Amino acid sequence: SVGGILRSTGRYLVLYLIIVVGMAYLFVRLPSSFLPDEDQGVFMTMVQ
């Protein structure tokens, strides 16, 4: 199977650039944060 892929060569370079454009799209779409808020089994309530 790999032997057949090396005869193509240029066809998989185009498929690679699809993966990189897909990677680039998903990276900009995915919104960032620092650390998740965990359920620590306790919380508080302010009364003002």
Partner: protein
């Protein structure tokens, strides 16, 4: 928030350079390190 920010692209840029250089020393080739470094998007795409 005001004391610095968005410093990861600077540190990852040099990280790519030092990985290129280490690979270049391993194989004794300026060209061959690119064959390793082109696999970086293959991991990132699945994570995203």
């Amino acid at each position: 928030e005001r004391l610095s920010g968005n410093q990861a692209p600077s540190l990852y840029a040099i990280s790519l350079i030092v990985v290129f250089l280490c690979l270049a020393a391993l194989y004794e080739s300026w060209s061959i390190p690119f064959s390793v470094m082109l696999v970086v998007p293959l991991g990132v795409i699945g994570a995203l």
